[PDB]
UniProtKB/Swiss-Prot annotation, chain D:
The protein's assembly and partners: Component of the mitochondrial small ribosomal subunit (mt-SSU). Mature yeast 74S mitochondrial ribosomes consist of a small (37S) and a large (54S) subunit. The 37S small subunit contains a 15S ribosomal RNA (15S mt-rRNA) and 34 different proteins. The 54S large subunit contains a 21S rRNA (21S mt-rRNA) and 46 different proteins.
Subcellular location: Mitochondrion
Further information: Present with 1920 molecules/cell in log phase SD medium.
Superkingdom of origin: Eukaryota
Annotated family: Belongs to the mitochondrion-specific ribosomal protein mS23 family.
Residues represented out of the complete protein: 54 to 106 of 264
Biological source species: Saccharomyces cerevisiae (strain ATCC 204508 / S288c) (Baker's yeast)
Function according to Swiss-Prot or TrEMBL: Component of the mitochondrial ribosome (mitoribosome), a dedicated translation machinery responsible for the synthesis of mitochondrial genome-encoded proteins, including at least some of the essential transmembrane subunits of the mitochondrial respiratory chain. The mitoribosomes are attached to the mitochondrial inner membrane and translation products are cotranslationally integrated into the membrane.
Gene (UniProt): RSM25
Protein name in the entry: Small ribosomal subunit protein mS23
Signal sequence range: none
Lineage of producing organism: Eukaryota, Fungi, Dikarya, Ascomycota, Saccharomycotina
UniProtKB/Swiss-Prot annotation, chain E:
InterPro entries assigned: Ribosomal_bS6, Ribosomal_bS6_sf, Transl_elong_EF1B/ribsomal_bS6
Source organism: Saccharomyces cerevisiae (strain ATCC 204508 / S288c)
Molecular function per GO: small ribosomal subunit rRNA binding; structural constituent of ribosome
The encoding gene: MRP17
Family the UniProt entry places it in: Belongs to the bacterial ribosomal protein bS6 family.
Gene3D superfamilies xref list: 3.30.70.60
Predominant place of localization: mitochondrion
Gene Ontology cellular component annotations, sorted alphabetically: mitochondrial inner membrane; mitochondrial small ribosomal subunit; mitochondrion
Protein name, per record: Small ribosomal subunit protein bS6m
UniProtKB/Swiss-Prot annotation, chain F:
Full-sequence range covered: 160 to 212 of 318
Recorded name of the encoding gene: PET123
Subcellular location: Mitochondrion
Name the record gives this protein: Small ribosomal subunit protein mS26
Function as written in the Swiss-Prot or TrEMBL entry: Component of the mitochondrial ribosome (mitoribosome), a dedicated translation machinery responsible for the synthesis of mitochondrial genome-encoded proteins, including at least some of the essential transmembrane subunits of the mitochondrial respiratory chain. The mitoribosomes are attached to the mitochondrial inner membrane and translation products are cotranslationally integrated into the membrane.
Further facts: Present with 2010 molecules/cell in log phase SD medium.
Highest taxon, organism lineage: Eukaryota
From Swiss-Prot, chain G:
Keyword Aminoacyl-tRNA synthetase attached: no
Subunit structure: Component of the mitochondrial small ribosomal subunit (mt-SSU). Mature yeast 74S mitochondrial ribosomes consist of a small (37S) and a large (54S) subunit. The 37S small subunit contains a 15S ribosomal RNA (15S mt-rRNA) and 34 different proteins. The 54S large subunit contains a 21S rRNA (21S mt-rRNA) and 46 different proteins.
Annotated protein name in UniProt: Small ribosomal subunit protein bS1m
Subcellular locations according to the entry: Mitochondrion
GO cellular component: mitochondrial inner membrane; mitochondrial small ribosomal subunit; mitochondrion
Subcellular location, principal: mitochondrion
Biological source species: Saccharomyces cerevisiae (strain ATCC 204508 / S288c) (Baker's yeast)
Protein encoded by which gene: MRP51
InterPro entries: Rbsml_bS1m-like
Length: 154, 53, 117, 53, 131, 53, 300
């Protein structure tokens, strides 16, 4: 759900403003892939599965009995009195989805505004979804993949 | 544990008549009649015992 | 039929305590089908379905409680668990996963408390 | 020493409750996010306080 | 439905103060029991002075015999009883309030419930187990 | 990341779940049925004070 | 850890109290813990509380409710006067005695069931000692208990038919007795109000044991003479005794035969003069008050 992803992006911005160290997001495959990319790119300190009440200390198998109570817990980073994850916005919106070929993704990473999408800025992460997998735009260009430009994180 | 006799049957029949007048559907609110109808309708359409949704 | 249960049950309990056998009883032996008039026949004329439900509910609760205790204990003792599986016909249960084998245990505990009963 | 942030799953409540009913699904309280409890300063309690009173 | 009737009967004869009240209770009780109704209780409240001088059928009153009657009947019967009470010259004031039976089948009169006795069984069991 | 997001209920787990849920519904129906009979008994005890004749 | 230390801190030792610091009802015993500061700490407004007490306070004793409040002040009253009432009682050397001749609460006596013959009086006190209980929390004592007692039905349906079958077939006058005992026997193991909050004996007013004589240079003291004040110039209405103010306590004064003539003369200013009294006895009531009886010793 792109709506759920929009909710998460707005949630992370709200948490950054108040500087909470730990927050939770909905437990779904898309959310987990989104969070994992942020973690590997250095935007998130930690990524743990858990429940509505907090991160799990020991592994808890997820089943239909507890799926409704599952959450993903992410740790936010702050350095030099500045939040590392300041902004998080969707590019492809629920009411206007954007699919780009690899050629147009290369132009976006080269300073060209494609379909009103502002080009990639220094230190910014743009995520792309291809065949239900989320990857950095630079990785999609390396794999010659065409995909939906989901969001940009800075 | 026994060794006021028994009540006359006419008195026990009057106790039954009072209980059946107090519990008569024709003496109760219309909402009670509708509650019974909902149960009857549910059992004619249910897929299994306990199917209400 | 003006005859009422209370009155009829007051004749089967007075005729059974006085010895009188008016033809009404024979009729009552047809109104209800109760050919024999004993203290254990009025108790079976006045049986309420609720009583049966109360016993079915205890059996249902027993089964659930027994299945859970059995599997709970079996899992606590890996040795008794491995034996349990072999006794029920599992081949080399030792070489199995927790989920691949707990399902077997659950399927067996529920095959030893629901099939035998 | 009470643990904060732990949710008891329905799998951990196999036996019936004080009402005689089994728990088969999460309740409404279990489905509300409880992040606020992680940040609220815990209320410190002591058994000795009860004896002192 | 359970109903609670409170009627203020006229005391015409000072020698027989509780005469029209008895005659009236019999009339109302007969309507109830003859129309599939049940009379649960009849609590006399005694002669009381009216809060003011009241009027009815071109007559004035300064006192009345108060009585309560808890009865079970259908809505149609309850309206019939109220219509007869509003027309009887004996009755000065009459009110019929419904007593909810949603939670329990045996409710005592408001007078008794005000004193802590919620059911007629509590009143009867305090007249047998302790009297 | 490699762990499956959801593990479907085994057929056995679904059987035990159905037993508990059927029991929960049946127990509540029985308890309500018995409560109604206990109120009918307490109404019989007082029906001697009610007037129908 | 810090949590362990905090629990044992001197501030933790003071039991939580939100009772009104300004109470205008009847006072029978202390309600707040007196806090004392040394002269050196008083010079620096240090009382061991959260914040400095205002320098205006010159007393070394206070009583408080809250360390801090939404009004950014401490809720305290700079008074410690219940200690002087206790010390003045000690100076009168009158031991507190039981008017009912009960066992001394400060001694571990071997008691027996002599008073336990009222099992039905106190077992039901748990549900009947509800003078000031909520209309629905007290009603929760009816269903919650009914289920607990109803869970012992099988145990009492077998014990009664195995220990007293005759009563079950003859009369219930003795069956009711076996019921009261059964629940208590099955409740002594339970913990219903296992902690009793009632005042124990004197409540700490006096730990003096009766019996000792007071030696003096002029011989053994046989009658204790204490200065006091008569409050009213007319005996307590409906009572045959006046009221006196002796040592921070209000006592009932019994006169030899007549009332001194200074009463009529002084009138409503009788409290302005000091008389000598003899303290006959001192008793303790269940409310926690002290029933001091005195005698207006008049110069003769």
């Amino acid at each position: 759900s792109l709506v759920k992803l929009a909710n998460t992006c707005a949630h992370l911005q709200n948490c950054s403003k108040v500087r909470v160290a730990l927050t939770s997001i909905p437990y779904t495959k898309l959310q987990l892939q989104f969070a994992y990319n942020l973690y590997q790119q250095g935007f998130l300190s930690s990524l743990q599965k858990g429940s509505t009440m907090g991160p799990d200390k020991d592994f808890v198998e997820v089943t239909p009995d507890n799926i409704s109570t599952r959450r993903l817990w992410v740790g936010l980073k702050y350095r030099d009195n500045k939040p590392v994850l300041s902004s998080c916005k969707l590019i492809s919106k629920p009411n206007s989805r954007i699919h780009l070929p690899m050629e147009d993704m290369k132009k976006l990473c080269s300073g060209v505004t494609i379909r009103n999408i502002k080009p990639l800025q220094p230190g910014e992460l743009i995520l792309v979804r291809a065949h239900n997998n989320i990857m950095d735009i630079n990785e999609a260009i390396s794999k010659k993949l065409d995909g939906e430009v989901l969001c940009r994180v800075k | 544990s026994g060794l006021v006799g028994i009540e006359d049957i006419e008195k026990l029949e009057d106790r039954r008549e009072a209980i059946l007048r107090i519990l008569s559907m024709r003496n109760s609110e219309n909402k009670n009649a509708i509650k019974m109808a909902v149960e009857l309708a549910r059992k004619e359409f249910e897929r299994f015992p306990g199917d209400t949704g | 039929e003006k005859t009422t249960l209370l009155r009829d049950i007051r004749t089967i309990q007075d005729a059974l305590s006085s010895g009188s056998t008016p033809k009404e009883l024979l009729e009552i032996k047809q109104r209800y089908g109760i050919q024999d008039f004993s203290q254990e026949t009025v108790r079976q004329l006045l049986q309420l379905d609720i009583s049966g439900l109360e016993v079915n509910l205890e059996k249902q609760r027993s089964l659930i409680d027994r299945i859970q205790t059995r599997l709970s204990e079996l899992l606590s003792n890996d040795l008794k668990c491995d034996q349990f599986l072999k006794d029920h016909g599992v081949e080399d249960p030792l070489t199995l996963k927790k989920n691949i084998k707990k399902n077997l245990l659950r399927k067996h505990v529920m095959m030893d408390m629901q099939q035998p009963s | 020493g009470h643990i904060i942030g732990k949710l008891v799953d329905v799998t951990e409540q196999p036996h019936a409750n004080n009402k005689g009913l089994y728990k088969t699904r999460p309740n409404s309280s279990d489905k509300r996010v409880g992040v606020k409890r992680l940040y609220r300063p815990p209320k410190l309690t002591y058994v000795e306080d009860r004896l002192r009173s | 439905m359970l109903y609670e009737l409170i009627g203020l009967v006229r005391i015409t004869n000072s020698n027989a103060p509780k005469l029209e009240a008895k005659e009236l209770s019999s009339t109302i009780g007969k309507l109830i029991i003859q129309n599939r109704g049940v009379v649960r209780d009849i609590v006399p409240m005694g002669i009381r002075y009216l809060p003011k001088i009241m009027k009815k059928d071109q007559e004035k009153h300064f006192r009345a015999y108060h009585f309560l009657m808890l009865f079970d009947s259908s809505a149609a019967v309850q309206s019939e009883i109220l219509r007869t009470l509003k027309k009887d010259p004996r009755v000065i004031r009459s009110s019929i309030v419904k007593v909810d039976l949603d939670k329990q089948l045996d409710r005592a009169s408001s007078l008794h419930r005000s004193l802590g006795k919620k059911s007629i069984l509590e009143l009867v069991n305090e007249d047998y187990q302790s009297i | 990341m490699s762990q499956p997001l959801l593990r479907n209920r085994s057929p056995e787990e679904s059987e035990l779940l159905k037993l508990k849920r059927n029991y929960n519904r049946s127990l509540l129906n029985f308890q309500a049925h018995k409560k109604k009979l206990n109120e009918l008994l307490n109404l019989y005890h007082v029906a001697n004070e009610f007037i129908v004749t | 850890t810090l949590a362990e230390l905090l629990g044992r801190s001197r501030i933790a030792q003071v039991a939580n109290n939100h009772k009104p610091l300004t109470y205008t009802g009847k006072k029978f015993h202390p309600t707040h813990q007196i806090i004392e500061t040394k002269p050196s700490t008083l010079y620096r407004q240090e009382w061991g509380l959260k914040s400095a007490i205002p320098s205006k306070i010159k007393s070394r004793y206070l009583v408080y409710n809250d360390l801090d409040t939404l009004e950014r002040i401490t809720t305290f009253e700079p008074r410690g006067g219940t200690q002087w009432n206790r010390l003045r009682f000690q100076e009168m050397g009158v031991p507190i005695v039981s008017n009912i001749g009960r066992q001394n609460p400060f001694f571990k006596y071997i008691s027996r069931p002599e008073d336990e013959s009222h099992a039905k009086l106190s077992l039901f006190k748990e549900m009947k000692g509800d003078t000031d209980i909520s209309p629905a929390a007290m009603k929760k004592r009816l269903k919650k208990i009914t289920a607990l007692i109803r869970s012992f039905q099988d145990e009492f349906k077998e014990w009664l038919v195995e220990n007293h079958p005759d009563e079950l077939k003859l009369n219930s006058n003795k069956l009711e007795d076996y019921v009261v005992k059964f629940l208590n026997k099955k409740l002594e193991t339970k913990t219903n109000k296992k902690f009793n909050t009632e005042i124990i004996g004197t409540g700490g007013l006096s730990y003096s044991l009766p019996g000792k004589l007071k030696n003096s240079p002029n011989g053994v003291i046989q009658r204790t003479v204490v200065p006091g004040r008569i409050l009213n110039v007319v005996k307590e209405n409906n009572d045959n005794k006046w009221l006196a103010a002796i040592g921070g306590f209000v006592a009932d004064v019994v006169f030899f035969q007549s009332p001194p003539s200074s009463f009529n003369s002084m009138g409503d200013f009788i409290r302005m003069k000091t008389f000598l009294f003899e303290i006959l006895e001192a008793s303790m009531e269940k409310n926690g008050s002290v029933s001091m009886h005195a005698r207006l010793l008049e110069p003769q």
